[PDB]
């Protein structure tokens, strides 16, 4: 079938060539204009250049700072806990190998954006004020 290969429809297009006649429309000038800076070989003004007027970033002032002891957590809402068995024990070591948490940055925090639908026992580092309200309402008990 190597003599009858056929690509997909609309998946290949041919490149445009400039400066190869007038019938194409991209011939002598090739689409640059007439006797300007943008028509010369080598480029033009840099991206943020405004032609002499003060740039927007120079006009605006700086704000804030960075903290060296920034701690981040991997959030897990109450919607992603509908797959485990009823009454099972959920631990960070399991969530990282089951397929819910791909990378535990600095711990697992459980939020409450949704309903649990099951009675479980959860072990995590931090719990939302509403995550524990609904975890202890469906049975079981959480712990840090």
């Amino acid at each position: 079938k190597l003599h009858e290969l056929k690509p997909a429809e609309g998946s290949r297009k041919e490149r445009n060539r400039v400066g190869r006649g007038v019938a194409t429309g991209n011939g002598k000038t090739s689409g640059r204009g007439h006797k300007g800076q943008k028509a010369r070989s080598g480029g033009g003004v840099r991206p943020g250049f405004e032609g002499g007027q003060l740039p927007l970033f120079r006009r605006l002032p700086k704000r804030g700072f960075t903290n060296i002891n920034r701690k981040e957590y991997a959030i897990v809402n109450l919607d992603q806990l509908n797959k485990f068995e009823d009454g099972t024990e959920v631990t960070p070591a399991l969530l990282v190998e089951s397929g819910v948490v791909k990378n535990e940055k600095s711990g697992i925090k459980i939020l409450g954006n949704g309903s649990l639908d099951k009675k479980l026992t959860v072990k995590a580092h931090k719990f939302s004020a509403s995550a524990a309200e609904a975890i202890d309402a469906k049975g079981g008990a959480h712990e840090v």
Binding site: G48, L56, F57, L60, P61, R63
Partner: protein
Amino acid sequence: PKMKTHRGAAKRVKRTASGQLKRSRAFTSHLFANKSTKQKRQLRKARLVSKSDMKRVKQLLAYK
């Protein structure tokens, strides 16, 4: 090589959830005796980069 980020611009804006950029205001360093109370009070609020300035500095913040 990879493109470099405009360090001067990274200190003056932040990326929102919808792809916008939040900035600060101008006329806030000094000379407060020449401005009105309402004028100074309403300048403490933040704004967003206009739709015309984004077309010029898009690639400047492609990694933020």
